[PDB]
Design a protein around this ligand. Structure first.
Ligand code: 3HA
Ligand code: 3HA
Ligand code: FE2
Ligand code: FE2
Ligand code: FE2
Ligand code: FE2
Lengths: 173, 173
């Protein structure tokens, strides 16, 4: 039938035109609305203390500049570098915290709409004892707008940030 | 848990190392195996007379060189140009025939594994009366290997290529 999502267009030029809109905490912009593939560009600098626990995979292609992913691989606080030109496929549920410090950076991130009842988690870990401080689960509907309200609630509440092993109150900063 | 799909790596350099393997009819190479996102690069020159009827969306990013998509939009034999640097999201079921004439071209194509019972179609249309000549449906398991055997069967059989409106026998060439 129709091309619902429009005609091909130049991506470098699209990124240039929307550069001034790539803004924190999360830094992104969705290219097409109501699609099954969720196609965003993420710039910087961003502010993220959360780990994301995505029930599906996440494709990355660091188009401009560099960034890294803080991970928890196999229990250990780990890092994956998104050097300019790198690509990478995250397995479902690997906890990850995108750090994007470079102004003018641009990373293509691709995900899919989540079916009903498949939940996304956002977690924070204690920077002293390294144990789970807080975890919210959300039925995700916008990878752009549903994020910061969630982090504000954590940021605004030392009961959420108080650790349950040590009593260290996470800075959320 | 583990990074099942490995660590980030440089995509331009990966494409360079596998250039000599991007070979017709279809021209592709999957970057990761057993993933839900099916991430391929497609080079050229390719030989495609089929239209693909994908039950899911297809993301394109023409990385090197140019290509086009022959389409059937709203009944009309149409074209979408994949100019170097273009991106594009195909809606599910839009019939499309990727033409990739340029040696050394490279296009990122992203799709997802198809659930059980969601079928892919490959169709051919009559180049005289413009009506459907032949359509096979397949449970797709490899976007790389399941293709040409299907086209050989059409190519090898004038009963499949004989049109049911006119009697024009499609060249399959
Ligand atoms: N992985 C991300 C996500 O799931 C949402 C928003 C941004 C990112 C990112 O990688 O920057
Ligand atoms: N759309 C394609 C597909 O579905 C399989 C293989 C190649 C392509 C292509 O766009 O070249
Ligand atoms: Fe994420
Ligand atoms: Fe702690
Ligand atoms: Fe296709
Ligand atoms: Fe015909």
């Amino acid at each position: 039938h129709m091309l619902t999502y429009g005609a091909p267009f130049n991506f470098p030029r699209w990124i240039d035109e929307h550069a001034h809109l790539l803004k924190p905490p999360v830094g992104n912009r969705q290219v097409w609305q109501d699609s099954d593939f969720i196609v965003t560009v993420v710039g910087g600098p961003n502010h993220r203390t959360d780990y994301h626990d995505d029930p599906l995979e996440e494709f990355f292609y660091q188009l401009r500049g560099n960034a890294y992913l803080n991970l928890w691989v196999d229990g250990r606080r780990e890092r994956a570098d998104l050097k300019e030109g790198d690509i990478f496929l995250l397995p479902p549920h690997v906890r990850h915290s995108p750090q994007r410090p470079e102004a003018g950076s641009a990373c293509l991130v691709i995900e899919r709409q989540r079916p009903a009842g498949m939940l996304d988690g956002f977690e924070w870990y204690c920077d002293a004892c390294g144990h789970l401080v807080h975890r919210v689960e959300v039925q995700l509907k916008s990878i752009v707008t549903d994020l910061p309200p969630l982090f504000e609630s954590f940021y605004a509440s030392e009961d959420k940030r108080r650790c349950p092993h040590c009593g260290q109150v996470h800075p959320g900063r």
